[PDB]
Assembly symmetry: C2
Homo-oligomer: 282 residues x 2
Protein backbone atom coordinates (compact mmCIF):
# COMPACT_ATOMS: atom_id res chain seq x y z
CA UNK A 1 0.00 0.00 0.00
CA UNK A 2 0.99 3.65 -0.45
CA UNK A 3 0.96 5.73 2.74
CA UNK A 4 0.38 9.50 2.75
CA UNK A 5 3.46 11.48 3.70
CA UNK A 6 3.72 14.40 6.14
CA UNK A 7 6.67 16.80 5.88
CA UNK A 8 7.75 19.87 7.82
CA UNK A 9 9.89 22.13 5.66
CA UNK A 10 11.44 25.57 6.15
CA UNK A 11 13.34 28.34 4.41
CA UNK A 12 15.76 30.31 6.57
CA UNK A 13 18.34 32.90 5.57
CA UNK A 14 20.98 32.45 8.28
CA UNK A 15 22.92 35.63 7.41
CA UNK A 16 26.53 35.42 6.27
CA UNK A 17 29.12 35.67 9.04
CA UNK A 18 30.78 39.10 8.96
CA UNK A 19 32.51 41.65 11.20
CA UNK A 20 29.85 44.38 10.94
CA UNK A 21 27.14 42.17 12.43
CA UNK A 22 29.51 40.96 15.15
CA UNK A 23 30.33 44.54 16.13
CA UNK A 24 26.59 45.30 16.34
CA UNK A 25 26.05 42.39 18.74
CA UNK A 26 24.48 40.20 16.03
CA UNK A 27 27.55 38.02 15.59
CA UNK A 28 27.33 34.56 14.05
CA UNK A 29 28.91 32.89 17.07
CA UNK A 30 26.25 34.26 19.40
CA UNK A 31 23.32 33.71 16.98
CA UNK A 32 23.77 30.26 15.50
CA UNK A 33 23.27 28.20 18.65
CA UNK A 34 19.79 29.81 18.86
CA UNK A 35 19.15 29.14 15.16
CA UNK A 36 20.01 25.46 15.78
CA UNK A 37 17.67 25.31 18.77
CA UNK A 38 14.82 26.68 16.61
CA UNK A 39 15.42 24.04 13.93
CA UNK A 40 15.26 21.34 16.58
CA UNK A 41 12.36 22.73 18.60
CA UNK A 42 10.26 23.51 15.53
CA UNK A 43 10.94 20.10 13.99
CA UNK A 44 12.31 21.05 10.56
CA UNK A 45 12.55 17.78 8.58
CA UNK A 46 14.29 19.49 5.70
CA UNK A 47 15.10 23.15 5.14
CA UNK A 48 16.78 25.47 2.67
CA UNK A 49 19.29 27.95 4.02
CA UNK A 50 20.90 31.00 2.44
CA UNK A 51 24.11 33.01 2.94
CA UNK A 52 26.23 30.45 4.78
CA UNK A 53 29.95 30.25 4.16
CA UNK A 54 31.34 26.75 4.55
CA UNK A 55 32.52 27.40 8.10
CA UNK A 56 28.96 28.35 9.08
CA UNK A 57 27.61 25.14 7.51
CA UNK A 58 30.06 23.10 9.59
CA UNK A 59 28.98 24.92 12.76
CA UNK A 60 25.34 24.23 11.98
CA UNK A 61 25.88 20.54 11.32
CA UNK A 62 27.85 20.27 14.57
CA UNK A 63 24.92 21.96 16.34
CA UNK A 64 22.44 19.65 14.59
CA UNK A 65 23.10 15.98 15.43
CA UNK A 66 21.20 13.87 12.94
CA UNK A 67 21.25 16.43 10.11
CA UNK A 68 23.41 16.56 7.01
CA UNK A 69 23.55 19.18 4.27
CA UNK A 70 24.07 19.35 0.52
CA UNK A 71 24.98 22.26 -1.73
CA UNK A 72 28.20 23.81 -3.01
CA UNK A 73 29.79 27.26 -2.78
CA UNK A 74 28.42 29.75 -5.30
CA UNK A 75 31.80 31.36 -6.10
CA UNK A 76 33.67 28.35 -7.48
CA UNK A 77 31.27 25.44 -7.09
CA UNK A 78 33.43 24.01 -4.33
CA UNK A 79 34.17 25.58 -0.91
CA UNK A 80 34.18 29.29 -1.79
CA UNK A 81 31.39 31.81 -1.27
CA UNK A 82 27.86 31.70 0.13
CA UNK A 83 25.78 28.53 -0.22
CA UNK A 84 22.16 27.69 -0.85
CA UNK A 85 22.69 24.67 1.38
CA UNK A 86 19.82 22.25 2.11
CA UNK A 87 19.77 20.55 5.54
CA UNK A 88 17.80 17.36 6.18
CA UNK A 89 17.30 14.68 8.85
CA UNK A 90 19.37 11.69 7.82
CA UNK A 91 17.09 9.32 9.73
CA UNK A 92 14.15 10.45 7.56
CA UNK A 93 15.41 10.78 3.97
CA UNK A 94 17.80 9.15 1.55
CA UNK A 95 19.32 11.19 -1.26
CA UNK A 96 18.61 9.69 -4.66
CA UNK A 97 20.39 12.46 -6.54
CA UNK A 98 21.71 15.94 -5.74
CA UNK A 99 23.13 18.87 -7.70
CA UNK A 100 23.55 22.61 -8.18
CA UNK A 101 23.09 25.02 -11.06
CA UNK A 102 23.87 28.74 -11.40
CA UNK A 103 21.05 31.14 -12.22
CA UNK A 104 22.44 32.26 -15.57
CA UNK A 105 22.61 31.60 -19.31
CA UNK A 106 25.31 29.04 -18.45
CA UNK A 107 23.95 27.14 -15.41
CA UNK A 108 26.78 24.58 -15.27
CA UNK A 109 29.50 27.12 -14.51
CA UNK A 110 29.94 29.69 -11.72
CA UNK A 111 28.70 32.78 -13.53
CA UNK A 112 26.55 35.89 -13.24
CA UNK A 113 23.28 35.72 -15.11
CA UNK A 114 21.70 38.32 -17.37
CA UNK A 115 21.74 41.65 -15.47
CA UNK A 116 22.72 40.30 -12.03
CA UNK A 117 25.71 41.66 -10.06
CA UNK A 118 26.70 38.47 -8.21
CA UNK A 119 26.71 34.79 -9.18
CA UNK A 120 23.70 33.04 -7.66
CA UNK A 121 23.31 29.33 -7.10
CA UNK A 122 20.36 26.97 -6.80
CA UNK A 123 21.07 23.71 -4.99
CA UNK A 124 18.70 20.77 -5.08
CA UNK A 125 18.18 17.22 -3.98
CA UNK A 126 15.93 14.42 -5.17
CA UNK A 127 14.87 12.89 -1.84
CA UNK A 128 13.17 9.64 -0.85
CA UNK A 129 11.30 9.29 2.44
CA UNK A 130 12.61 6.30 4.38
CA UNK A 131 9.20 5.51 5.86
CA UNK A 132 6.77 5.91 2.96
CA UNK A 133 9.11 5.81 -0.02
CA UNK A 134 7.67 9.13 -1.24
CA UNK A 135 10.06 10.79 -3.71
CA UNK A 136 10.24 14.56 -4.33
CA UNK A 137 12.55 17.35 -5.49
CA UNK A 138 13.65 20.09 -3.09
CA UNK A 139 15.21 23.26 -4.58
CA UNK A 140 16.76 26.16 -2.69
CA UNK A 141 18.18 29.48 -3.93
CA UNK A 142 19.03 33.10 -3.23
CA UNK A 143 18.11 35.58 -5.97
CA UNK A 144 20.14 38.60 -7.12
CA UNK A 145 19.12 41.95 -5.60
CA UNK A 146 19.97 44.13 -8.63
CA UNK A 147 19.17 42.05 -11.71
CA UNK A 148 15.44 42.22 -12.39
CA UNK A 149 15.74 40.41 -15.70
CA UNK A 150 17.91 37.82 -13.95
CA UNK A 151 15.23 37.17 -11.30
CA UNK A 152 12.53 36.64 -13.92
CA UNK A 153 14.75 34.46 -16.11
CA UNK A 154 15.82 32.57 -13.00
CA UNK A 155 12.22 31.73 -12.16
CA UNK A 156 11.71 30.07 -15.54
CA UNK A 157 15.06 28.26 -15.48
CA UNK A 158 14.11 26.76 -12.14
CA UNK A 159 10.80 25.59 -13.59
CA UNK A 160 12.68 24.00 -16.52
CA UNK A 161 14.99 22.18 -14.08
CA UNK A 162 11.97 20.96 -12.09
CA UNK A 163 10.87 19.08 -15.19
CA UNK A 164 14.36 18.04 -16.33
CA UNK A 165 15.33 16.62 -12.93
CA UNK A 166 12.27 14.38 -12.83
CA UNK A 167 14.26 12.23 -15.28
CA UNK A 168 11.14 11.32 -17.23
CA UNK A 169 8.90 11.25 -14.17
CA UNK A 170 6.52 13.80 -12.73
CA UNK A 171 8.27 14.44 -9.39
CA UNK A 172 6.56 16.91 -7.04
CA UNK A 173 8.78 19.83 -6.08
CA UNK A 174 9.35 22.14 -3.15
CA UNK A 175 11.24 25.41 -3.74
CA UNK A 176 12.59 27.55 -0.86
CA UNK A 177 14.82 30.60 -0.88
CA UNK A 178 15.52 34.26 -0.33
CA UNK A 179 13.93 35.86 -3.39
CA UNK A 180 15.16 39.36 -2.44
CA UNK A 181 11.99 41.14 -3.59
CA UNK A 182 8.43 40.81 -2.35
CA UNK A 183 5.18 39.36 -3.66
CA UNK A 184 4.24 42.42 -5.76
CA UNK A 185 7.11 41.69 -8.17
CA UNK A 186 7.26 40.11 -11.61
CA UNK A 187 9.59 37.31 -10.45
CA UNK A 188 7.05 36.26 -7.82
CA UNK A 189 4.34 36.14 -10.50
CA UNK A 190 6.73 34.13 -12.65
CA UNK A 191 6.47 31.16 -10.27
CA UNK A 192 2.73 31.16 -9.61
CA UNK A 193 0.77 32.87 -12.39
CA UNK A 194 0.30 29.67 -14.43
CA UNK A 195 -0.24 27.36 -11.44
CA UNK A 196 3.01 25.42 -11.96
CA UNK A 197 3.80 26.22 -8.30
CA UNK A 198 1.75 27.50 -5.36
CA UNK A 199 2.75 30.00 -2.68
CA UNK A 200 2.39 28.22 0.71
CA UNK A 201 1.37 31.58 2.19
CA UNK A 202 -1.64 31.67 -0.12
CA UNK A 203 -2.57 27.99 -0.22
CA UNK A 204 -2.18 26.95 3.44
CA UNK A 205 -5.26 25.84 5.40
CA UNK A 206 -3.88 27.61 8.47
CA UNK A 207 -1.86 30.85 8.32
CA UNK A 208 0.22 32.13 11.26
CA UNK A 209 1.88 35.32 10.06
CA UNK A 210 2.60 37.96 12.70
CA UNK A 211 5.21 39.48 10.43
CA UNK A 212 6.77 39.38 6.98
CA UNK A 213 10.08 37.64 6.49
CA UNK A 214 12.83 40.29 6.58
CA UNK A 215 13.63 42.00 9.89
CA UNK A 216 17.07 43.62 9.37
CA UNK A 217 18.06 42.47 12.88
CA UNK A 218 15.46 44.92 14.19
CA UNK A 219 13.30 43.19 16.79
CA UNK A 220 10.65 45.93 16.42
CA UNK A 221 10.23 45.88 12.62
CA UNK A 222 7.04 45.15 10.76
CA UNK A 223 6.21 44.59 7.10
CA UNK A 224 3.68 42.77 4.95
CA UNK A 225 6.43 42.11 2.40
CA UNK A 226 7.45 38.46 2.09
CA UNK A 227 10.79 37.91 0.36
CA UNK A 228 11.43 34.40 1.64
CA UNK A 229 8.97 31.92 0.14
CA UNK A 230 8.20 28.25 0.01
CA UNK A 231 6.63 27.33 -3.34
CA UNK A 232 5.26 23.83 -3.90
CA UNK A 233 3.74 21.77 -6.67
CA UNK A 234 -0.08 21.94 -6.52
CA UNK A 235 -0.07 18.19 -5.81
CA UNK A 236 1.03 18.97 -2.24
CA UNK A 237 -1.62 19.88 0.28
CA UNK A 238 -0.37 22.84 2.32
CA UNK A 239 -1.61 22.37 5.89
CA UNK A 240 0.03 25.27 7.69
CA UNK A 241 2.31 28.26 7.24
CA UNK A 242 4.11 30.04 10.06
CA UNK A 243 6.63 32.82 10.45
CA UNK A 244 8.63 32.15 13.61
CA UNK A 245 9.36 35.39 15.49
CA UNK A 246 11.28 33.76 18.36
CA UNK A 247 13.89 36.05 19.92
CA UNK A 248 16.79 35.62 22.31
CA UNK A 249 18.32 38.24 24.63
CA UNK A 250 21.71 39.84 25.07
CA UNK A 251 23.17 42.17 27.69
CA UNK A 252 22.98 45.82 26.66
CA UNK A 253 26.48 47.30 26.49
CA UNK A 254 21.53 44.24 34.19
CA UNK A 255 19.67 45.59 31.16
CA UNK A 256 18.90 43.40 28.13
CA UNK A 257 17.65 43.76 24.58
CA UNK A 258 15.83 41.48 22.17
CA UNK A 259 17.92 39.99 19.36
CA UNK A 260 16.70 38.14 16.28
CA UNK A 261 18.50 34.83 15.56
CA UNK A 262 18.96 36.01 11.96
CA UNK A 263 18.02 39.09 9.97
CA UNK A 264 15.19 37.09 8.45
CA UNK A 265 12.52 35.06 10.21
CA UNK A 266 12.29 31.37 9.27
CA UNK A 267 9.27 30.36 7.23
CA UNK A 268 7.92 26.98 8.36
CA UNK A 269 5.44 25.00 6.25
CA UNK A 270 3.72 21.70 7.01
CA UNK A 271 2.82 19.65 3.96
CA UNK A 272 0.97 16.45 3.21
CA UNK A 273 1.25 14.34 0.08
CA UNK A 274 -1.33 11.66 -0.79
CA UNK A 275 0.40 9.15 -3.10
CA UNK A 276 -2.93 7.71 -4.35
CA UNK A 277 -4.82 10.95 -5.09
CA UNK A 278 -2.91 14.19 -5.56
CA UNK A 279 -4.17 15.59 -8.85
CA UNK A 280 -5.96 18.88 -9.37
CA UNK A 281 -8.40 19.46 -12.19
CA UNK A 282 -11.11 22.09 -12.73
CA UNK B 1 -1.42 -1.16 22.87
CA UNK B 2 -0.73 2.46 21.99
CA UNK B 3 0.94 5.01 24.29
CA UNK B 4 -0.53 8.47 24.78
CA UNK B 5 1.00 11.75 23.61
CA UNK B 6 -0.16 15.11 24.98
CA UNK B 7 0.94 18.69 24.44
CA UNK B 8 0.10 20.78 27.47
CA UNK B 9 0.74 24.39 28.32
CA UNK B 10 0.42 27.01 31.05
CA UNK B 11 -0.31 30.57 30.06
CA UNK B 12 -1.18 33.59 32.18
CA UNK B 13 -3.35 35.63 29.79
CA UNK B 14 -3.37 38.77 31.95
CA UNK B 15 -6.61 40.21 33.33
CA UNK B 16 -8.39 42.71 31.08
CA UNK B 17 -7.88 46.22 32.44
CA UNK B 18 -7.89 49.85 31.32
CA UNK B 19 -4.28 50.48 32.32
CA UNK B 20 -2.92 47.83 29.94
CA UNK B 21 -5.27 49.08 27.22
CA UNK B 22 -4.00 52.65 27.56
CA UNK B 23 -0.40 51.38 27.33
CA UNK B 24 -1.16 49.52 24.09
CA UNK B 25 -1.40 46.04 25.63
CA UNK B 26 -5.18 45.89 25.62
CA UNK B 27 -7.00 42.55 25.79
CA UNK B 28 -8.89 43.19 22.54
CA UNK B 29 -5.60 43.57 20.69
CA UNK B 30 -3.84 40.65 22.45
CA UNK B 31 -6.31 37.78 22.56
CA UNK B 32 -6.56 37.14 18.81
CA UNK B 33 -2.79 36.62 18.87
CA UNK B 34 -2.93 34.41 21.97
CA UNK B 35 -5.59 32.29 20.25
CA UNK B 36 -3.40 31.93 17.17
CA UNK B 37 -0.51 30.75 19.37
CA UNK B 38 -2.74 28.17 21.01
CA UNK B 39 -3.67 26.82 17.57
CA UNK B 40 -0.28 27.12 15.84
CA UNK B 41 1.60 25.60 18.75
CA UNK B 42 -0.88 22.73 19.05
CA UNK B 43 -1.93 22.99 22.71
CA UNK B 44 -4.11 19.96 23.43
CA UNK B 45 -4.98 21.14 26.92
CA UNK B 46 -3.72 24.17 28.78
CA UNK B 47 -4.12 25.98 32.08
CA UNK B 48 -4.85 29.71 31.99
CA UNK B 49 -4.66 32.39 34.68
CA UNK B 50 -6.22 35.82 35.27
CA UNK B 51 -9.20 35.66 32.88
CA UNK B 52 -12.53 37.21 33.74
CA UNK B 53 -15.59 35.48 32.28
CA UNK B 54 -15.75 37.88 29.34
CA UNK B 55 -12.16 37.07 28.35
CA UNK B 56 -12.99 33.36 28.48
CA UNK B 57 -15.94 33.96 26.18
CA UNK B 58 -13.62 35.81 23.77
CA UNK B 59 -11.16 32.91 23.86
CA UNK B 60 -13.82 30.24 23.32
CA UNK B 61 -15.10 32.18 20.30
CA UNK B 62 -11.58 32.39 18.85
CA UNK B 63 -10.96 28.69 19.60
CA UNK B 64 -13.96 26.85 18.16
CA UNK B 65 -12.53 23.37 18.78
CA UNK B 66 -12.00 24.08 22.49
CA UNK B 67 -14.09 24.35 25.63
CA UNK B 68 -13.00 25.20 29.18
CA UNK B 69 -13.73 24.30 32.78
CA UNK B 70 -13.22 26.35 35.95
CA UNK B 71 -15.25 28.86 37.97
CA UNK B 72 -14.61 32.44 39.11
CA UNK B 73 -12.55 32.78 42.28
CA UNK B 74 -14.71 35.57 43.80
CA UNK B 75 -18.03 33.74 44.16
CA UNK B 76 -17.41 30.24 42.80
CA UNK B 77 -19.62 31.02 39.81
CA UNK B 78 -19.07 33.75 37.20
CA UNK B 79 -17.31 36.48 39.23
CA UNK B 80 -13.58 37.19 39.49
CA UNK B 81 -10.47 35.89 37.74
CA UNK B 82 -10.41 32.20 36.75
CA UNK B 83 -7.88 29.38 36.66
CA UNK B 84 -9.72 28.08 33.59
CA UNK B 85 -8.46 24.96 31.81
CA UNK B 86 -9.01 24.89 28.04
CA UNK B 87 -9.04 21.59 26.13
CA UNK B 88 -9.69 20.21 22.65
CA UNK B 89 -13.20 18.77 22.62
CA UNK B 90 -12.25 16.29 19.89
CA UNK B 91 -9.47 14.82 22.03
CA UNK B 92 -10.88 14.60 25.55
CA UNK B 93 -14.00 13.80 27.50
CA UNK B 94 -14.49 15.25 30.98
CA UNK B 95 -15.06 12.44 33.47
CA UNK B 96 -15.30 14.79 36.47
CA UNK B 97 -14.32 18.38 37.30
CA UNK B 98 -14.06 20.71 40.28
CA UNK B 99 -12.38 23.65 41.98
CA UNK B 100 -11.04 24.44 45.41
CA UNK B 101 -9.71 27.60 47.04
CA UNK B 102 -6.14 27.71 48.29
CA UNK B 103 -6.95 28.19 51.96
CA UNK B 104 -7.85 26.60 55.27
CA UNK B 105 -11.40 26.38 53.89
CA UNK B 106 -10.95 24.98 50.34
CA UNK B 107 -14.68 24.34 49.82
CA UNK B 108 -15.61 28.04 49.65
CA UNK B 109 -14.35 31.30 48.13
CA UNK B 110 -11.84 32.44 50.72
CA UNK B 111 -8.37 33.86 51.34
CA UNK B 112 -5.78 31.52 52.79
CA UNK B 113 -3.28 32.13 55.58
CA UNK B 114 -1.29 35.30 54.88
CA UNK B 115 -2.57 35.68 51.29
CA UNK B 116 -4.07 39.01 50.21
CA UNK B 117 -6.51 37.73 47.58
CA UNK B 118 -8.60 34.58 47.18
CA UNK B 119 -6.78 32.05 44.98
CA UNK B 120 -8.44 29.17 43.17
CA UNK B 121 -7.25 25.86 41.80
CA UNK B 122 -9.43 24.31 39.08
CA UNK B 123 -9.12 20.70 37.97
CA UNK B 124 -10.45 18.07 35.59
CA UNK B 125 -10.41 14.29 35.38
CA UNK B 126 -9.96 13.84 31.62
CA UNK B 127 -10.18 10.80 29.34
CA UNK B 128 -8.32 10.71 26.03
CA UNK B 129 -10.55 9.80 23.08
CA UNK B 130 -7.83 7.99 21.10
CA UNK B 131 -6.39 5.70 23.80
CA UNK B 132 -8.80 5.99 26.72
CA UNK B 133 -5.94 7.24 28.92
CA UNK B 134 -7.28 9.04 32.00
CA UNK B 135 -5.43 11.70 33.96
CA UNK B 136 -5.91 14.68 36.24
CA UNK B 137 -5.16 18.24 35.16
CA UNK B 138 -4.85 20.92 37.88
CA UNK B 139 -4.33 24.62 37.31
CA UNK B 140 -3.82 27.54 39.69
CA UNK B 141 -2.54 31.01 40.41
CA UNK B 142 -0.69 31.50 43.72
CA UNK B 143 -0.72 34.57 45.95
CA UNK B 144 1.96 37.22 45.42
CA UNK B 145 2.14 38.30 49.08
CA UNK B 146 1.40 35.25 51.24
CA UNK B 147 4.57 33.19 51.69
CA UNK B 148 2.92 30.82 54.16
CA UNK B 149 -0.08 30.67 51.83
CA UNK B 150 2.14 29.55 48.94
CA UNK B 151 3.85 26.84 50.98
CA UNK B 152 0.61 25.60 52.55
CA UNK B 153 -1.11 25.72 49.15
CA UNK B 154 1.55 23.44 47.70
CA UNK B 155 0.74 20.78 50.25
CA UNK B 156 -3.02 21.29 49.98
CA UNK B 157 -2.76 20.82 46.23
CA UNK B 158 -0.79 17.62 46.74
CA UNK B 159 -3.39 16.47 49.23
CA UNK B 160 -6.17 17.05 46.69
CA UNK B 161 -4.26 15.11 44.02
CA UNK B 162 -4.03 12.15 46.40
CA UNK B 163 -7.73 12.32 47.24
CA UNK B 164 -8.89 12.73 43.63
CA UNK B 165 -6.13 10.63 42.09
CA UNK B 166 -7.02 7.76 44.42
CA UNK B 167 -4.62 8.82 37.65
CA UNK B 168 -1.32 10.46 36.64
CA UNK B 169 -1.42 14.21 37.26
CA UNK B 170 -0.33 17.40 35.54
CA UNK B 171 -0.23 20.69 37.40
CA UNK B 172 0.09 24.04 35.64
CA UNK B 173 -0.03 27.55 37.00
CA UNK B 174 1.44 30.94 37.77
CA UNK B 175 3.17 30.28 41.08
CA UNK B 176 4.15 33.92 41.40
CA UNK B 177 7.63 33.29 42.83
CA UNK B 178 10.50 31.45 41.16
CA UNK B 179 12.32 28.14 41.49
CA UNK B 180 14.57 29.44 44.27
CA UNK B 181 11.70 29.73 46.76
CA UNK B 182 10.37 27.31 49.38
CA UNK B 183 6.96 26.80 47.75
CA UNK B 184 8.72 25.39 44.69
CA UNK B 185 10.66 22.95 46.90
CA UNK B 186 7.40 21.90 48.51
CA UNK B 187 6.25 20.53 45.14
CA UNK B 188 9.36 18.60 44.08
CA UNK B 189 11.52 17.75 47.12
CA UNK B 190 9.80 14.40 47.67
CA UNK B 191 9.39 13.18 44.09
CA UNK B 192 5.58 13.47 44.09
CA UNK B 193 5.83 15.87 41.14
CA UNK B 194 8.60 16.73 38.69
CA UNK B 195 9.43 20.10 37.14
CA UNK B 196 9.09 19.77 33.32
CA UNK B 197 12.01 22.21 32.98
CA UNK B 198 14.36 19.75 34.71
CA UNK B 199 12.92 16.44 33.51
CA UNK B 200 12.53 17.22 29.79
CA UNK B 201 14.62 15.34 27.19
CA UNK B 202 14.94 18.60 25.25
CA UNK B 203 14.86 22.14 26.69
CA UNK B 204 14.15 25.27 24.65
CA UNK B 205 14.38 28.18 27.07
CA UNK B 206 15.46 31.52 25.61
CA UNK B 207 13.90 33.33 28.57
CA UNK B 208 12.18 32.92 31.93
CA UNK B 209 8.40 33.09 32.05
CA UNK B 210 7.50 36.63 33.15
CA UNK B 211 8.07 39.58 30.79
CA UNK B 212 6.06 42.50 32.27
CA UNK B 213 4.97 43.38 28.69
CA UNK B 214 8.60 44.29 27.95
CA UNK B 215 9.82 42.66 24.67
CA UNK B 216 13.43 43.22 25.81
CA UNK B 217 13.30 41.69 29.30
CA UNK B 218 15.34 38.72 30.42
CA UNK B 219 15.34 36.63 33.57
CA UNK B 220 16.41 33.19 34.73
CA UNK B 221 13.43 33.21 37.09
CA UNK B 222 10.61 30.85 36.14
CA UNK B 223 7.36 31.63 37.92
CA UNK B 224 5.12 29.63 35.60
CA UNK B 225 5.59 25.87 35.86
CA UNK B 226 4.22 22.61 34.60
CA UNK B 227 4.72 19.91 37.23
CA UNK B 228 3.98 16.29 36.31
CA UNK B 229 3.71 12.87 37.97
CA UNK B 230 7.02 10.97 37.68
CA UNK B 231 5.22 8.39 35.53
CA UNK B 232 5.11 10.85 32.61
CA UNK B 233 7.90 10.92 30.07
CA UNK B 234 8.71 14.61 29.48
CA UNK B 235 9.82 14.88 25.84
CA UNK B 236 10.32 18.61 25.42
CA UNK B 237 9.92 21.94 27.21
CA UNK B 238 9.65 25.30 25.50
CA UNK B 239 9.08 28.93 26.43
CA UNK B 240 7.39 30.57 23.43
CA UNK B 241 8.74 34.10 22.89
CA UNK B 242 6.55 34.91 19.85
CA UNK B 243 5.75 38.62 19.49
CA UNK B 244 3.33 40.67 17.37
CA UNK B 245 3.69 44.33 16.31
CA UNK B 246 1.69 47.49 16.92
CA UNK B 247 1.89 50.91 15.32
CA UNK B 248 4.09 53.16 17.40
CA UNK B 249 2.29 56.19 18.84
CA UNK B 250 4.60 53.83 9.88
CA UNK B 251 6.88 52.99 12.80
CA UNK B 252 6.31 49.82 14.83
CA UNK B 253 7.17 48.16 18.11
CA UNK B 254 7.23 44.61 19.42
CA UNK B 255 4.40 43.55 21.71
CA UNK B 256 4.11 40.43 23.84
CA UNK B 257 0.78 38.62 23.58
CA UNK B 258 0.70 38.59 27.38
CA UNK B 259 2.97 39.72 30.22
CA UNK B 260 4.00 36.10 30.66
CA UNK B 261 5.30 33.72 27.99
CA UNK B 262 3.50 30.40 27.55
CA UNK B 263 5.24 27.25 28.76
CA UNK B 264 4.59 24.34 26.40
CA UNK B 265 5.41 20.77 27.38
CA UNK B 266 5.16 17.62 25.30
CA UNK B 267 4.38 14.52 27.34
CA UNK B 268 4.24 10.82 26.63
CA UNK B 269 2.72 8.16 28.86
CA UNK B 270 3.92 4.71 27.87
CA UNK B 271 2.81 1.36 29.34
BR1 LIG C 1 34.49 29.23 4.98
BR1 LIG D 1 8.77 11.60 6.57
BR1 LIG E 1 11.36 41.06 -10.18
BR1 LIG F 1 11.83 45.48 7.32
BR1 LIG G 1 -1.54 18.66 -9.84
BR1 LIG H 1 -16.67 39.42 33.08
BR1 LIG I 1 -9.80 25.88 17.27
BR1 LIG J 1 7.55 30.77 48.78
Amino acid sequence: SYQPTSLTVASYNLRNANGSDSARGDGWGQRYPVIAQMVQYHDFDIFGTQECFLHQLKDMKEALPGYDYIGVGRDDGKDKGEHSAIFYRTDKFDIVEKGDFWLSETPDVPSKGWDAVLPRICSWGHFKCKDTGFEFLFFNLHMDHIGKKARVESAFLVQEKMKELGRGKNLPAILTGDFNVDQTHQSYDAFVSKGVLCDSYEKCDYRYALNGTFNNFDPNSFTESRIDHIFVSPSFHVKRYGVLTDTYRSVREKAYEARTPSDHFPVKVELVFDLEHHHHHH
